[PDB]
Design an enzyme around this catalytic site. Structure first.
Site, PDB file in Angstrom:
ATOM      1  N   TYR A   1       6.884 -27.031  20.050  1.00 37.24           N
ATOM      2  CA  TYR A   1       7.337 -25.599  19.607  1.00 37.24           C
ATOM      3  C   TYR A   1       6.394 -25.000  18.256  1.00 37.24           C
ATOM      4  O   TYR A   1       5.852 -25.943  17.789  1.00 37.24           O
ATOM      5  CB  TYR A   1       8.689 -25.590  19.281  1.00 37.24           C
ATOM      6  CG  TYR A   1       9.374 -26.335  18.249  1.00 37.24           C
ATOM      7  CD1 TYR A   1       9.519 -26.086  17.003  1.00 37.24           C
ATOM      8  CD2 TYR A   1       9.891 -27.673  18.784  1.00 37.24           C
ATOM      9  CE1 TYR A   1       9.871 -26.573  15.949  1.00 37.24           C
ATOM     10  CE2 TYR A   1      10.518 -28.458  17.655  1.00 37.24           C
ATOM     11  CZ  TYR A   1      10.407 -28.016  16.292  1.00 37.24           C
ATOM     12  OH  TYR A   1      10.958 -28.865  15.347  1.00 37.24           O
TER      13      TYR A   1
ATOM     14  N   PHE B   1       8.034 -21.316   9.415  1.00 39.08           N
ATOM     15  CA  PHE B   1       8.944 -22.190   8.931  1.00 39.08           C
ATOM     16  C   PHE B   1       9.092 -23.520   9.580  1.00 39.08           C
ATOM     17  O   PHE B   1       9.447 -24.537   8.855  1.00 39.08           O
ATOM     18  CB  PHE B   1      10.339 -21.658   8.967  1.00 39.08           C
ATOM     19  CG  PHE B   1      11.278 -21.869  10.311  1.00 39.08           C
ATOM     20  CD1 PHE B   1      10.899 -21.063  11.215  1.00 39.08           C
ATOM     21  CD2 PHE B   1      12.070 -22.661  10.289  1.00 39.08           C
ATOM     22  CE1 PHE B   1      11.361 -21.245  12.509  1.00 39.08           C
ATOM     23  CE2 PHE B   1      13.031 -22.948  11.372  1.00 39.08           C
ATOM     24  CZ  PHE B   1      12.628 -22.039  12.573  1.00 39.08           C
ATOM     25  N   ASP B   2       8.770 -23.696  10.774  1.00 43.16           N
ATOM     26  CA  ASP B   2       8.729 -24.872  11.297  1.00 43.16           C
ATOM     27  C   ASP B   2       7.624 -25.195  12.400  1.00 43.16           C
ATOM     28  O   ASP B   2       7.181 -24.167  12.986  1.00 43.16           O
ATOM     29  CB  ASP B   2       9.987 -25.260  11.963  1.00 43.16           C
ATOM     30  CG  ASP B   2      10.257 -26.718  12.388  1.00 43.16           C
ATOM     31  OD1 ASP B   2       9.440 -27.597  12.398  1.00 43.16           O
ATOM     32  OD2 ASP B   2      11.431 -26.793  13.088  1.00 43.16           O
TER      33      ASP B   2
ATOM     34  N   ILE C   1      19.659 -24.959  19.548  1.00 44.75           N
ATOM     35  CA  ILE C   1      20.484 -23.771  19.600  1.00 44.75           C
ATOM     36  C   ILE C   1      20.269 -23.261  20.865  1.00 44.75           C
ATOM     37  O   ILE C   1      19.615 -23.472  21.911  1.00 44.75           O
ATOM     38  CB  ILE C   1      19.928 -22.894  18.526  1.00 44.75           C
ATOM     39  CG1 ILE C   1      18.434 -22.784  18.680  1.00 44.75           C
ATOM     40  CG2 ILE C   1      20.074 -23.012  17.115  1.00 44.75           C
ATOM     41  CD1 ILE C   1      18.018 -21.479  17.970  1.00 44.75           C
TER      42      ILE C   1
ATOM     43  N   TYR D   1      21.275 -19.376  14.635  1.00 43.56           N
ATOM     44  CA  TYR D   1      22.032 -19.942  13.558  1.00 43.56           C
ATOM     45  C   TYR D   1      23.115 -19.087  13.185  1.00 43.56           C
ATOM     46  O   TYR D   1      24.356 -19.503  12.575  1.00 43.56           O
ATOM     47  CB  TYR D   1      21.322 -20.644  12.694  1.00 43.56           C
ATOM     48  CG  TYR D   1      20.516 -21.834  12.748  1.00 43.56           C
ATOM     49  CD1 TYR D   1      21.128 -22.868  12.926  1.00 43.56           C
ATOM     50  CD2 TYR D   1      19.321 -21.567  13.179  1.00 43.56           C
ATOM     51  CE1 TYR D   1      20.365 -24.253  13.423  1.00 43.56           C
ATOM     52  CE2 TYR D   1      18.505 -22.815  13.396  1.00 43.56           C
ATOM     53  CZ  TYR D   1      19.028 -23.904  13.412  1.00 43.56           C
ATOM     54  OH  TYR D   1      18.444 -25.104  13.841  1.00 43.56           O
TER      55      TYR D   1
ATOM     56  N   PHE E   1       9.625 -18.327  18.501  1.00 39.68           N
ATOM     57  CA  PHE E   1       8.905 -19.696  18.882  1.00 39.68           C
ATOM     58  C   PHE E   1       7.683 -19.591  19.925  1.00 39.68           C
ATOM     59  O   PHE E   1       7.943 -18.923  20.773  1.00 39.68           O
ATOM     60  CB  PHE E   1      10.123 -20.469  19.634  1.00 39.68           C
ATOM     61  CG  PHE E   1      11.175 -20.845  18.447  1.00 39.68           C
ATOM     62  CD1 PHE E   1      11.151 -21.994  17.672  1.00 39.68           C
ATOM     63  CD2 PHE E   1      12.269 -20.216  18.588  1.00 39.68           C
ATOM     64  CE1 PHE E   1      12.221 -22.105  16.980  1.00 39.68           C
ATOM     65  CE2 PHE E   1      13.406 -20.314  17.604  1.00 39.68           C
ATOM     66  CZ  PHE E   1      13.210 -21.429  17.077  1.00 39.68           C
TER      67      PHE E   1
END
Lengths: 820, 384, 375, 107
Positions: free
Chosen positions: D26, D36-37, D56, D82, D99
């Site tokens: 991802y 962020f990731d 999630i 979230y 994503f």
């Protein structure tokens, strides 16, 4: 913009280099809940690139290595570093093969020293735990302060250790070239951050034996040869680099010390087996010795009749050659020990050319050369090098001070020892953090997992060696100290810590003695702990002296002065916590006074016999401070004890004067019962403070004087009146409702049991007329009341049980004594 | 009221007495027994006296009529002034020896601690209110001990400082309401130039020692500075300045201050508030004890952070409190952290704020995880 | 139990090995002697290769020992409320102290060699500021008894044996120009915290000895846990030995300084405080007499308690001699106005009856002989 | 609440069924474009077990609808993300996620 532009935009460089310091601050001291969060802002790739980025500025380079260390390493490193000071050595074949010197052909007394930190070490160290940082993972359904503690974010250690070694190699060669543009802008910025990373990986134990050999070659490529390229000890380094060099040598010195301790444990493994076999065979020979011997057998059978602690003492008592006659060991065993002593001294460099030839001489000369080359300005560097120098010269003494924390265990309990060391690490990690609800549930289960650990009972000496009772005690004291005036926060932890300490006292006497040494420390912190309910800090202090005559006699009178002074305050001021709930104000604290009194009950009475010295000191302190007795017994302007007892009886019966008038809190205070229980605990204390019967028979002057004082203070008439006071009875009625009183706010049998004990020990029962006068009005209504209660309904009711214990423990032995 | 008090009060400034004789010329002559001399409290400027209504009190300097205020020193308690000599005098009374008895020369009485001790003194602090008894006990002899020049100079500095600042405060709240409009100032003129000079004297009086000094004599200047700061706080100067900033802060801008004090007082407003903040910082910088006083009013400094007249001065005060008191960090709440972050958002990229936020996490090697979580929860995820 | 309990060969290997380890260290490691104290200070006092350097500057950058002493003086001069137990300062104070003394008719010409070698080893330290370092650790300790201050006193004595006139001059000069009251305030607090004979602690010790309780893992017979009567006797002895060494050689300059410090703001009369300690010691001795007045024989613990109390009173009396000799007229008037006379009367009263009681039997010969040189 | 757009189609036949773990690379991003990731930054595949909800809801359902070898983009509503509490210190509350999922392998 390119981040390398910050070598000229110094306004952004100052801000960013502070931002990295904020990143290290928010994740400092094991905040792994946050250290995972930072892995989104600064990924693994950025950190790994910044490892090799040669054009980064100074402060940003050191900030980024220290940010890597803070995020991914320090929590594991600190916890490991704590366990480096204890040497728990399991008995395994690997432990057996451990020897002081490698098998070689250099010299019989001592071969060449092995490479420090290289070899096999069997000492117990818990493994590290990491988690892969994943921000798409489902949020845990477990609420805060209940979920398991987060682990350090993972990072590939094999790649990190290889890249770190490669960077150190390049730095060493670049420093040798004397380039005009060292990496990061200066030699300090080139070497210090990397040496920090190397030091952290060594302490964590990431490096294998081959890598450690490489590092030893980098430090000194000629001394550390097993059998430009210039080492780190000749490059004319600044002061800052020298500090990290000292940290490296201090790690190799520690690995040398642990190697010695493991070698000693291996020798103990072999030596006990031979010595036990020899002493067993000599026992078999002593079994037939009587046929060829006579009355001289006492000396030879003394060893087999002597406790094992000193059997070894005599068996090993042949060092000085002038006492061999006591030693029954054969000369082969004696030569064995006298051989292992000699090479042990050689390996510690006692006794047995610019080549140092060993680590001890290398460090000692290196330190002296640095000291006499220039006036060292850094106090932390000066301390760091002189600690090393002292360790090198005093090789034996360091082993001597390392032995008390050494311990050997059976291999059958290693995996339980692991879980013990993990929970100990959890406890130790709470010394440096302000406690919160998340950590509180961490340590309650950490303690409970020590409870359920069989090694906590099977090896009680080990717990004292690990110092677990101390670390729990400072965890207690920090929480007590924080808000020591207003109100005790987190009572739910303190009630577990006190319980753990009391459990620790009851394991053995030595555990009790060690906890006893902190008596004054517990007393000073016990002033406010009475606010909470359950197991107070004071109940630890009591548990440190219960049923121990030696401890009770060794109890300093100053501590008694402290407790009576606290009792004085409890008899002069109200309880603020009680006042805050809306309780009617009375000018003294009964609950706090009682909690001091029932401790003094354990200080003065041991194993059913009063302690004379403590009893006399106590009574002469309470008379000197008459306010300890309360509103009654006050003297001038004070009513009688009985006047107080029926006053509190009426108050306890009356609602809206017994409490706030708005159990509910499950330990709701009842002022009437608190006052009554205070007086009963005071009287029971004085009863236990009364001199024993044989002292009065011997007619000792002070024993008579003390009994005279107690008689003057508490007249017999009030005692008989209280024993004559009625007791509420559990009644049946209103469709089988077994109505029972509230024992937390009513006249209980134990108050009378204290009255009876005082009457027995102080006044006694001498003549028949007074005996029967006590019996008909004081005991007989309770005897018939308990007789009636024994039915198919009330026999299990609690108040009936209370009367059963009261009669069988206070009345019936007295009557059995006064039978003639 | 005078007391015989013990403990740490016997090193504070309140326990300092000056022997002021009756003669101007040769007032520094040696002490002879039984010669008249007043007693003066340095920090308050009052004289020991026998008053009619309250017995032994310290009366103002304006009403010491030399009859009820004179005293004598004597070696014995028998019932007994001489002719002055124009010289250095006869030297007999010593320091650390030569126990003295002080007698009021007019009424002949003797000073002695009052025996009664009520319920408040049953367990509380043992202060024995001295009374000039007619005959008194036997052990009421007094020793005489020095105080170093730094203490004596400091004490007089508080005494001089208090009158000026109290006058300034009185002027300040005199025109608290009643706007000038277009007329003259309401009451008496403010001693602006005197105050500004006093502040600059104090700020230089509390300058921390320079870094390059030798460690041997650096520490003795640290001990001197901590001692001076504690003396000022114990005498109330640290509270007095808090009053000063309290009164000055009710006016938002200099022009707004002009409407209530005058156009002449407006130009000195920004300077006087900045100097007050610098004096506060120098008073509290380095003391755990003085920094601990901001626990009760931590929101006071935080609420003033967004003020524009002296932003760096108040940030300096905040940084000095936080870098010194581990107790204060436990009182920190999300309002304060969101106020500090609002400073970063409104006053630009100021690294001294990051120097504050670093101090909020770890203090004296102990982490405060509530602050760490709040900071990471209110600062990092925004990414702006 | 002894006839039925477990022989050694039946114990588990780990439980036997732990016992072996702790017995081995006590009987083979503690017993071992290793004299390395002189071979550090020999190396550390050499400014090696500096003659090769030949630095022009007068400053003459310190050799390692002087750098170490400077560092310890720095950490003693730093403003701290308390003093921490520096385990290396403890180890190096012991090393420095042990590297000085190193100690039927022998020649006075040999003694003339031994004295001037001991004075050389003392000069090896006091030329490097160790005299001022000792005074700083004493002033820094703030009058808290412990192994922290005790190692400092033992170093102070070890550089003052035989009354080194140079050390006494350096110490007096440093105290005079620093004008610090912390040194004498700490000496006074240390002296006031010293312990005298305790009857209550003696009775408790006797009863605890009567119990004779032992441990579980084996047995220790007649356990030698710490003595609770005059625990700090060795500390009071070497505190007064240090004070005596300060004034040894009739150093009237320092003798008048002990009585009164001119420079300082506050004067602490060490002489009077010494007398008040003597009074506290004799009160204890008299009350230890009276409890044995009825008893006819003096047992072992009682004898050992006298042996150490007499040794302490001997050291006090020697110090009081040193404070007086020369003669120091001011000190003589101080003792004249002191409580010494009452202390003398009490000692005489004890001596009168100790001679009579102890001469009736031959079992107290050593105790009586030890008592004799006290008076 | 989850929207999936293809980026580079794979096979379109073998879909991730229950009983086989999913392996993905991802690349998470906030709505405004602030990454962020990522998984390639850590340089390891993210093997998540489909069925027991280790991720999630939005990510799980989006990875469900993909195919082997397919590279797709998502859009996770806060309802399936979230949500109101967010991820403390990483994702702000009430944020829509994006994503860049590549489903490189199954198990």
């Amino acid at each position: 913009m390119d981040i390398l532009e910050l070598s000229e935009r110094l306004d952004l460089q100052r801000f960013h280099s502070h931002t990295l310091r904020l990143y290290r601050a928010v994740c400092a001291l094991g905040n792994n809940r946050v250290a995972h969060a930072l892995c989104s802002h600064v990924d693994q790739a950025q950190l790994l690139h910044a490892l090799e980025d040669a054009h980064l500025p100074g402060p940003l380079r050191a900030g980024y290595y220290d940010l890597l260390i803070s995020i991914h390493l320090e929590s594991a490193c600190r916890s490991r570093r704590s366990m480096l000071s204890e040497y728990i050595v399991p008995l395994t074949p690997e432990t057996r093969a451990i020897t002081l010197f490698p098998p070689g052909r250099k010299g019989g007394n001592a071969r060449r020293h092995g490479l420090p930190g290289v070899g096999v070490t069997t000492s117990l160290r818990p493994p590290h735990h990491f988690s892969p940082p994943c921000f798409v993972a489902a949020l845990p359904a477990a609420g805060v302060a209940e979920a398991p503690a987060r682990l350090s974010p993972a990072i590939p250690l094999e790649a990190l250790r290889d890249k770190a070694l490669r960077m150190l190699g390049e730095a060493v060669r670049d420093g040798g070239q004397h380039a005009r543009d060292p990496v990061g802008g200066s030699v300090e910025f080139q070497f210090v951050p990397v040496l920090k990373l190397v030091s952290t990986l060594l302490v964590m134990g990431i490096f294998g034996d081959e890598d450690v050999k490489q590092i030893l070659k980098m430090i000194e490529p000629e001394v550390f040869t097993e059998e430009l390229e210039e080492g780190l000890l000749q490059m004319k380094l600044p002061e800052s680099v020298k500090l990290q060099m000292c940290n490296l040598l201090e790690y190799f010195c520690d690995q040398e010390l642990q190697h010695r301790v493991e070698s000693l444990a291996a020798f103990a493994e072999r030596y006990v087996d031979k010595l036990q076999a020899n002493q067993r065979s000599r026992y078999a020979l002593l079994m037939r010795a009587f046929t060829m011997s006579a009355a001289e057998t006492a000396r030879r059978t003394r060893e087999f009749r002597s406790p094992p602690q000193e059997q070894i003492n005599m068996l090993l008592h042949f060092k000085d050659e002038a006492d061999e006659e006591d030693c029954p060991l054969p000369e082969d065993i004696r030569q064995d020990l006298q051989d292992f002593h000699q090479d042990l001294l050689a390996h510690c460099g006692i006794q047995l050319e610019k080549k140092p030839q060993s680590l001890q001489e290398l460090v000692s000369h290196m330190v002296v050369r640095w000291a006499q080359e220039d006036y060292v300005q850094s106090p932390e560097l000066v301390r760091a090098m002189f600690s090393l120098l002292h360790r090198q010269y005093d090789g034996l003494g360091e082993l001597l001070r390392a032995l008390p924390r050494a311990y050997t265990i059976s291999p059958s309990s290693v995996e339980d020892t692991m879980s013990l060391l993990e929970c100990l690490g959890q406890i130790r990690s709470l010394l440096i953090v302000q406690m919160g609800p998340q950590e509180e549930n961490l340590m309650i289960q950490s303690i409970g997992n020590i409870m359920n650990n069989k090694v906590f009972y099977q090896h009680p000496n080990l717990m004292r060696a690990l110092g677990m009772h101390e670390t729990v005690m400072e965890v207690m004291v920090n929480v007590l100290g924080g808000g020591e005036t207003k109100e005790i926060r987190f009572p739910k932890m303190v009630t577990s810590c006190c319980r753990f300490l009391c459990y620790f006292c009851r394991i053995s006497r030595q555990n009790q003695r060690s906890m006893f040494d902190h008596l004054s420390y517990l007393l000073e912190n016990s002033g406010i702990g009475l606010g909470m309910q359950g197991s107070t800090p004071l109940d630890v202090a009591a548990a440190s002296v219960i049923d121990n005559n030696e401890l009770a006699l060794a109890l300093q009178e100053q501590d008694l002065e402290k407790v009576v002074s606290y009792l004085a305050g409890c008899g002069l001021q109200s309880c603020p916590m009680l006042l805050a709930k809306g309780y009617p104000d009375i000018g003294w604290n009964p609950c706090g006074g009682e909690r001091y009194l029932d401790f003094l009950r354990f200080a003065v009475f041991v194993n059913g016999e009063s302690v004379e010295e403590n009893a006399n000191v106590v009574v002469r302190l309470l008379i000197r401070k008459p306010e300890c007795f309360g509103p009654a017994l006050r003297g001038e302007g004070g009513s009688g004890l009985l006047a107080a007892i029926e006053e509190a009886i009426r108050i306890s019966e009356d609602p809206a004067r017994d409490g706030p008038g708005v159990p509910p809190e499950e330990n709701r205070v009842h002022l009437g019962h608190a006052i009554m229980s205070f007086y009963a605990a005071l009287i029971d204390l004085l009863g236990r403070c009364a001199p024993e019967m044989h002292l009065i028979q011997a007619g000792k002057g002070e024993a008579l004087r003390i009994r005279a004082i107690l008689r003057s203070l508490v007249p017999l008439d009030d005692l008989v009146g209280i024993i004559s006071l009625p007791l509420q009875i559990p009644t049946l009625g209103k469709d089988g409702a077994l109505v029972q009183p509230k024992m937390s706010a009513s006249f209980v049998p134990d108050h009378k049991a204290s009255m009876v004990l005082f009457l027995d020990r102080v006044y006694g029962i001498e003549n028949q007329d007074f005996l029967l006068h006590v019996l008909d009005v004081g005991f007989l209504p309770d005897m018939r009341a308990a007789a009636s209660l024994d039915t198919a309904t009330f026999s299990t009711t609690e108040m009936a049980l209370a009367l059963n214990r009261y009669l069988c423990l206070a009345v019936l032995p007295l009557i059995t004594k006064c039978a003639p | 009221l005078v007391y015989y008090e013990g403990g740490a009060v016997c090193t504070h400034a309140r326990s300092l007495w000056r022997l002021e004789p009756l003669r101007i010329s040769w007032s520094g002559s040696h002490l002879r027994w039984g010669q008249p001399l007043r007693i003066r409290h340095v920090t308050t400027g009052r004289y020991l006296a026998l008053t009619e209504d309250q017995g032994l009190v310290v009366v103002d300097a304006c009403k010491a009529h030399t009859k009820a205020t004179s005293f004598c020193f004597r070696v014995s308690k028998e019932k007994l002034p001489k002719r002055d000599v124009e010289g250095m005098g006869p030297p007999e009374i010593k320091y650390g020896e030569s126990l003295c008895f002080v007698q009021h020369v007019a009424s002949g009485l003797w000073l002695t601690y009052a025996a009664p001790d009520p319920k408040a003194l049953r367990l509380g602090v043992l202060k024995k209110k001295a009374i000039l008894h007619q005959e008194g006990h036997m052990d009421d002899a007094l020793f005489l001990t020095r105080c170093q020049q730094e203490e004596s100079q400091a004490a007089r500095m508080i005494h001089s400082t208090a009158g000026l600042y109290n006058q300034f405060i009185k002027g300040l709240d005199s025109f608290s309401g009643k706007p000038r409009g277009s007329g003259p100032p309401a009451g008496p003129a403010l001693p602006i130039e005197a105050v500004i000079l006093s502040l600059q004297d104090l700020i230089g009086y509390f300058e921390p020692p320079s870094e390059e000094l030798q460690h041997e004599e650096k520490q003795s200047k640290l001990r001197s500075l901590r001692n001076r700061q504690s003396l000022f706080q114990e005498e109330g100067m640290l509270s007095l300045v808090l009053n000063c900033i309290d009164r000055l802060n009710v006016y938002t801008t200099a022009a707004h201050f002009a409407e209530y004090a005058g156009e002449e007082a407006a130009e000195s407003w920004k300077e006087i508030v900045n100097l007050l903040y610098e004096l506060l910082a120098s008073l509290i910088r380095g003391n755990r004890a003085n920094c601990a006083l901001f626990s009760t009013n931590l929101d006071w400094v935080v609420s003033k952070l967004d003020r524009l007249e002296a932003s760096s001065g108040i940030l300096e005060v905040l940084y000095c409190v936080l870098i010194e008191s581990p107790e204060v960090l436990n009182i920190i709440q999300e309002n304060h952290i969101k106020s500090i972050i609002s400073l970063l958002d409104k006053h630009g990229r100021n690294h001294k704020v990051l120097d504050v936020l670093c101090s909020l996490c770890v203090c004296n090697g102990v982490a405060v995880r509530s602050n760490q979580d709040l900071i990471t929860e209110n600062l990092l995820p925004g990414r702006e | 139990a002894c006839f039925r309990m477990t022989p050694l060969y039946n114990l588990p290997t780990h439980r036997a090995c732990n016992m072996f380890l702790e017995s081995y260290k006590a009987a083979w490691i503690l017993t071992e002697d290793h004299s390395f104290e002189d071979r550090m200070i020999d190396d550390l006092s050499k400014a090696g290769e500096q003659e090769e350097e030949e630095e022009e500057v007068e400053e003459k950058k310190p050799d390692p020992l002087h750098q170490l002493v400077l560092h310890f003086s720095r950490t003693a001069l730093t403003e701290k409320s308390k003093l921490d137990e520096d385990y290396l300062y403890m180890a190096y104070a012991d090393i420095m102290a042990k590297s000085c003394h190193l100690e039927v008719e022998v020649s006075f010409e040999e003694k003339e060699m031994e004295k001037q070698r001991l004075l050389y080893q003392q000069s090896r330290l006091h030329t490097r500021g160790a005299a001022e370092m000792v005074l700083q650790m004493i002033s820094a300790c703030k009058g808290e008894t412990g192994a922290m201050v005790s190692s400092t006193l033992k170093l102070g004595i070890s550089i003052l044996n035989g009354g080194n006139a140079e050390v006494q001059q350096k110490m007096l000069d440093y105290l005079k120009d620093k004008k610090e009251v912390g040194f004498f305030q700490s000496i006074q607090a240390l002296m006031q915290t010293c312990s005298v004979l305790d009857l209550n602690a003696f009775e408790r010790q006797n009863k605890a000895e009567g119990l004779g309780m032992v441990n579980e893992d084996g047995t220790v017979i007649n356990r030698q846990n710490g003595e609770k009567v005059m625990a700090d006797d060795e500390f009071t002895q070497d505190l007064f030995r240090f004070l005596q060494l300060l004034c040894e050689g009739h150093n009237n300059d320092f003798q008048n300084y002990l009585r009164t410090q001119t420079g300082n703001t506050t004067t602490i009369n060490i002489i009077i405080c010494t007398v008040d300690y003597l009074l506290r010691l004799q009160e204890s001795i008299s009350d230890f007499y009276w409890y044995y007045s009825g008893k006819d024989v003096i047992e072992e613990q009682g004898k050992r308690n006298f042996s150490k109390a007499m040794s302490v009173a001997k050291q006090v009396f020697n110090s009081l001699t040193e404070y007086i000799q020369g003669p120091c007229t001011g000190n003589q008037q101080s003792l004249a106005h002191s409580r010494l006379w009452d202390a003398v009367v009490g000692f005489l009263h004890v001596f009168a009856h100790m001679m009579m009681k102890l001469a009736q039997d031959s079992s107290q010969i050593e105790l009586l002989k030890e008592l004799l040189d006290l008076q | 609440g989850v929207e999936i757009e293809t980026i580079s189609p794979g096979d379109g036949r073998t879909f991730p069924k229950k009983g086989q773990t999913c392996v993905v690379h991802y690349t998470g991003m906030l709505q405004n474009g602030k990454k962020f990731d990522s998984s390639r930054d850590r340089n390891k595949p993210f093997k998540f077990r489909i069925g027991k909800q280790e991720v999630i809801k939005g990510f799980e359902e989006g990875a469900a609808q993909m195919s082997l070898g397919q590279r797709a983009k998502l859009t996770c509503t806060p309802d399936v993300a979230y949500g109101a509490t967010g991820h403390p210190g990483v994702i702000p509350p009430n944020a829509t996620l994006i994503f860049d999922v590549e489903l490189l392998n199954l198990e």
